[PDB]
Amino acid sequence: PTELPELLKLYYRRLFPYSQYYRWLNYGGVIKNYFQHREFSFTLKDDIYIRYQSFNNQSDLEKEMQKMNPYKIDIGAVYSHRPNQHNTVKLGAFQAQEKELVFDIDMTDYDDVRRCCSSADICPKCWTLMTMAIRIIDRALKEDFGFKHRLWVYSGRRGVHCWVCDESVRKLSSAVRSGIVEYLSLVKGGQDVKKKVHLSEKIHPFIRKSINIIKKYFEEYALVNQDILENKESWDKILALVPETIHDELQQSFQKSHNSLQRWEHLKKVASRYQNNIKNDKYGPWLEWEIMLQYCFPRLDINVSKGINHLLKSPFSVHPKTGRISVPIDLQKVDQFDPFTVPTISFICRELDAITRDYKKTSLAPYVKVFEHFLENLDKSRK
Ligand SMILES: Nc1nc(F)nc2c1ncn2[C@@H]1O[C@H](COP(=O)(O)OP(=O)(O)OP(=O)(O)O)[C@@H](O)[C@H]1O
Ligand SMILES: [Mn+2]
Ligand SMILES: [Mn+2]
Ligand SMILES: [Zn+2]
C-alpha cells in the first residue's frame, strides 16, 4: 500500500489512456460544456477524497491527475454548472442533469449460493456467475431496451460494471432508471428470506430468454464446479426452495443417486409433477426455473443504478485493494475473460521498462483496444 504512490506516478505519466478517455467523456464535443460540467472525485492517501472536481479540457485533466496521483478516480454526473464552482452557484440551482446509466455487480451478493468463496474473494469456479450476469443483462439492454452503446468493465476485485452511454439514456430520470432496474430484477429478499424467486404462471420473454442463457452454463457451473447437490448439507439448501410435500421423495432419490448430475434430473422430474393449484390440472417447470434463477441470475447493486448523482469507479482506475486496473471486457470473448490475468499497476510498470514508453508496450494494450472499439461505435453513431 506504500508502493502505490511511486507506481501511480508512472502510470499517470506514461500509461493512462488520456486521449481515449477524453474522447469518451467529451462525447464528440457536440454539447456545450458537457466535459467541463462533469464531476470527478479523487481518492488520495488515507481514504481521503475530494468531491466536485472538474476540468477545462484534456490537458487540464492530465495536469491535475499527474499532480495529485489519486489512488482512485470516480466519475459522477454532468451538472448544470462547473462542479468546481458549485459554491459560487445560488443554492438550489446546482443540479445533476445527465449521467450514463450504470450497473455494479458484486460477487459478494451471491454468497448464499456460492460454495467456493465468500466476502470479496473470487475464483474461476464462481466467476461464471459474472459471465451469466453480463450475458443476461447485456441481452436485455441491447434487445429489449434498444441501447446501443454499452461498456462492460472489470471492477478490479469482485465483479463487473456496465456503462450505458446512448445520448437519450444519459438524460434518463432516476424514476425511469429505477423502472429499468425493476424490469431486470428477479432475486429479491435479504438473508431473512429463504426463497428469493417466485414466478408467475406465464413467464415473460425476458425471463424465458434469461433462463435459456443459464441453461447453457448450469450443468458445468452448478452441478460440477459448485456441486450444489454433492451431499445432504448442500442439497438441503435446495429443498428449502420447494414445497415440503415433495421433500421425502427427493430425499430418497438423492440418497439413491451418485452425483449432482443425477440428483438434478430427479429434481426436475418431481418438480414437473407437483400440483401447485388444485383447481386445475396444470403442471410445469416453475420450481426448476426458480431454483436455477436463485443460484445463477444477476443480482444488481441496485442503488448504484437508481441515482443520477451516484459515483462509480472510472474505467482504467486502479482498485487500491488489489492493484488491478479496472479494464474493459471484450463482449466477443466474455467466456474467456480471466480476472487473474488482469494486469496490476505494478505488473505493467515493470513491463514498461523491462528489457515509445506508452501502454502499447504493456499488457494494458488489448484492453485499450476494446475501449477504442466502443469509442468508434459512439463516433459512428454521431456521424
Ligand atoms: N463511500 C462512498 N461514497 C461515495 F460517494 N461513492 C462511493 C462510496 N463507496 C463506493 N462508492 C462508489 O460506488 C461504486 C461501487 O462501490 P463498490 O462496489 O464497493 O466498488 P467497486 O465496484 O468499484 O469495486 P469492487 O470492490 O466491487 O470490485 C464505487 O466504484 C464508487 O464509485
Ligand atoms: Mn462493485
Ligand atoms: Mn457495490
Ligand atoms: Zn469462487
UniProtKB/Swiss-Prot annotation:
Recorded consequence of changing residue 104 to N: Decreases the binding affinity for NTPs
Binding site residues for a ribonucleoside 5'-triphosphate: 104-106, 155-161, 310-313, 319
Disulfide bridge map: none
Gene3D superfamilies (UniProt xref): DNA primase, PRIM domain (3.90.920.10)
Modulation of this protein's activity: The presence of the regulatory subunit PRIM2/p58 accelerates the kinetics of initiation and primer extension. Inhibited by arabinose nucleoside derivatives such as fludarabine and vidarabine.
Binding site for Mg(2+) 1: 104, 106
GO cellular component annotations of the record: alpha DNA polymerase:primase complex; membrane; nucleoplasm
Identification of the protein by name: DNA primase small subunit
Illness: Primordial dwarfism-immunodeficiency-lipodystrophy syndrome: An autosomal recessive syndrome characterized by growth failure with in utero growth retardation and severe postnatal growth restriction, severe microcephaly, absence of subcutaneous fat, and significant haematological and immune dysfunction. Patients have hypo- or agammaglobulinemia, lymphopenia, anemia, and thrombocytopenia. Most affected individuals die in early childhood from either respiratory or gastrointestinal infections.
Keywords, ordered alphabetically: Acetylation, Disease variant, DNA replication, DNA-directed RNA polymerase, Dwarfism, Magnesium, Manganese, Metal-binding, Nucleotidyltransferase, Primosome, Transcription, Transferase, Zinc
EC annotation from Swiss-Prot or TrEMBL: 2.7.7.102
PANTHER family tied to this protein: DNA PRIMASE SMALL SUBUNIT (PTHR10536)
Function, in words: Catalytic subunit of the DNA primase complex and component of the DNA polymerase alpha complex (also known as the alpha DNA polymerase-primase complex - primosome/replisome) which play an essential role in the initiation of DNA synthesis. During the S phase of the cell cycle, the DNA polymerase alpha complex (composed of a catalytic subunit POLA1, an accessory subunit POLA2 and two primase subunits, the catalytic subunit PRIM1 and the regulatory subunit PRIM2) is recruited to DNA at the replicative forks via direct interactions with MCM10 and WDHD1.
Outcome, altering residue 39 to A: Strongly decreases primase activity, which can be partially rescued by increasing primase concentration
Quaternary assembly: Heterodimer of a catalytic subunit PRIM1 and a regulatory subunit PRIM2, also known as the DNA primase complex. Interacts with PRIM2 (via C-terminus). Component of the alpha DNA polymerase complex (also known as the alpha DNA polymerase-primase complex) consisting of four subunits: the catalytic subunit POLA1, the regulatory subunit POLA2, and the primase complex subunits PRIM1 and PRIM2 respectively. Within the complex, POLA1 directly interacts with PRIM2.
Binding site for Zn(2+): 116-117, 123, 126
Chain sites annotated for binding Mn(2+) 1: 104, 106
One Pfam family it belongs to: DNA_primase_S
UniProt family annotation: Belongs to the eukaryotic-type primase small subunit family.
GO MF term list: DNA-directed RNA polymerase activity; magnesium ion binding; ribonucleotide binding; zinc ion binding
Catalytic residues in the record: 39, 104, 106
Catalytically driven reaction(s): ssDNA + n NTP = ssDNA/pppN(pN)n-1 hybrid + (n-1) diphosphate
Domain of life: Eukaryota
Effect of residue 111 to A: Slightly decreases primase activity
